[PDB]
């Protein structure tokens, strides 16, 4: 299994660990999303986790079809956005020469 495949599996397995708890087994309701963010994204969303209204807005923004659940398809955009945001932070104020990563999201 490639590294990339392993990472995608981690995303899928994490999502489903929470999505099966309550209601529809393939979507996260607000309760399930908040728990995932609180624990599994405790460093990447450290500041956001301090304001429950920010977390709820994040879910509202990701809830593409507006049904108050996150499908895996909607959720994976959060994964892409946070991966993007971590990489952006590793390059904040980058002067070169060459390529170097500062600490990413939730670090430093």
């Amino acid at each position: 299994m490639s590294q990339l495949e392993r990472n995608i599996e981690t995303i899928i397995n994490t999502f489903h660990q929470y999505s099966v708890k309550l209601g529809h087994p393939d979507t996260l309701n607000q309760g399930e999303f908040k728990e995932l963010v609180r624990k599994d994204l405790q460093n990447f969303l450290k500041k956001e986790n301090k304001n429950e209204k920010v977390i709820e807005h994040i879910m509202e923004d990701l809830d593409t079809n507006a049904d108050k659940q996150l499908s895996f398809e909607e959720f994976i955009m959060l994964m892409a956005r946070l991966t993007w945001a971590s990489h952006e932070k590793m390059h904040e104020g980058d002067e070169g020469p060459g390529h170097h990563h500062k600490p990413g999201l939730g670090e430093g």
């Binding site: 490639s2 590294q3 990339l4 495949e5 392993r6 990472n7 995608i8 599996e9 981690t10 995303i11 899928i12 994490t14 489903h16 393939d26 624990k39 599994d40 994204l41 405790q42 460093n43 990447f44 895996f72 398809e73 994976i76 955009m77 994964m79 892409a80 946070l82 991966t83 993007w84 971590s86 990489h87 590793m90 060459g98 390529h99 990563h101 990413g104 999201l105 939730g106 670090e107």
Partner: protein, 87 residues
């Protein structure tokens, strides 16, 4: 220390740079680099599309490479496809 999920996301960054740091622009995976990436990192049902087809699809600005944001298009597409296969 990062969570299991956060480690998977930072690993996606590392995977991309395994190929983007081969040559040239540090955030560019050229057509030959993408063939290597797909042959190494992606399952058969993804590779079968053809590396050339994927490249045309991912190089949205037709500048000759897949940058990190274009790569995330691939990651999103592979993750949704893997989800559909798994479930």
């Amino acid at each position: 220390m990062l969570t299991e999920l956060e480690k998977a996301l930072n690993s996606i960054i590392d995977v991309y740079h395994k190929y983007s740091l081969i040559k040239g622009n540090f955030h560019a995976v050229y057509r030959d680099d993408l063939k290597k990436l797909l042959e190494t990192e992606s399952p058969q049902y993804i590779r079968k599309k053809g590396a050339d087809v994927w490249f045309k699809e991912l190089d949205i600005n037709t500048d000759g490479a897949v940058n990190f944001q274009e790569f995330l298009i691939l990651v999103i597409k592979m993750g949704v496809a893997a989800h559909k296969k798994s479930h």
